[PDB]
């Protein structure tokens, strides 16, 4: 009962290549607040800022 033919040999499966996706988002920029005038002249307000 030993077969004369030799058995066929299986081919192993292909492994999966794990891949990541890196995307970026776009947040909208902020606008300016309102111009509020003050009492001070230029150099004092400049140094303060």
């Amino acid at each position: 009962g030993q077969p004369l033919h030799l058995p066929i040999y299986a081919t192993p499966a292909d492994p999966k290549a794990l891949l990541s996706a890196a995307v970026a988002t776009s947040q909208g920029g902020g606008k300016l607040p309102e111009s509020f005038i003050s009492l001070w002249r230029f150099p004092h307000m400049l140094e303060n800022a």
Partner: protein, 49 residues
């Protein structure tokens, strides 16, 4: 709870914005900004896919 599916799903941020902003295009029945996906499992597996 709802942050945990965001952690475990691994979806990127832009498609997540797309999913919340337009749930109907991902196959939920449509209703304008009222058609809400729950935290049920059929609307987990489709995000995962």
């Amino acid at each position: 709870q709802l942050t945990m599916i965001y952690r475990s799903s691994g979806i990127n941020e832009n498609a997540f914005r797309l999913f919340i902003e337009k749930p109907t295009i991902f196959g939920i029945p449509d209703e304008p900004n009222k058609a809400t996906p729950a935290h049920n499992a059929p609307t987990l597996i489709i995000l995962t896919r």
